[PDB]
Amino acid sequence: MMVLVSYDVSTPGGDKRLRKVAKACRDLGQRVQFSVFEIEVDPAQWTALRQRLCDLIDPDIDSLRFYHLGAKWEARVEHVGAK
């Protein structure tokens, strides 16, 4: 399943946390913007990755939002600008 992961990381140690989040996502998705990831995971993998993401961020100052994009999500996404 496709889960869109949007990471709003604070601007102290934030750069490291974004690096760690990107690394944790590397095998299971694509980093489509600086802090946005299109994650393709089955439910068990998502349980695992989600836990890691929760542990890697600082929930006091960062946030994560997760969106289930559904099937045929590729026809429902438009990119404008730099890649």
Place this chain on the structure above:
Amino acid sequence: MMVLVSYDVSTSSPGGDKRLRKVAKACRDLGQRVQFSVFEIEVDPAQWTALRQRLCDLIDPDIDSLRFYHLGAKWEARVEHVGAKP
């Protein structure tokens, strides 16, 4: 319909703060700023067409990007928020 707008604005170039401010202002009446640079827009198709044009015009596509996700209805996306709510 819900459209999720993700704005990746350059930090290495000047005016990014202003461009993000203008994008947020354009999204203010039809949506919610759910993260620093992410907006949930609740729009009919004509409103979306109009807003999309403004957002495209407001960014610098050489150094910024926008991604627009058509979510259908918000409930279909089973959205979860973890962490801070500034």
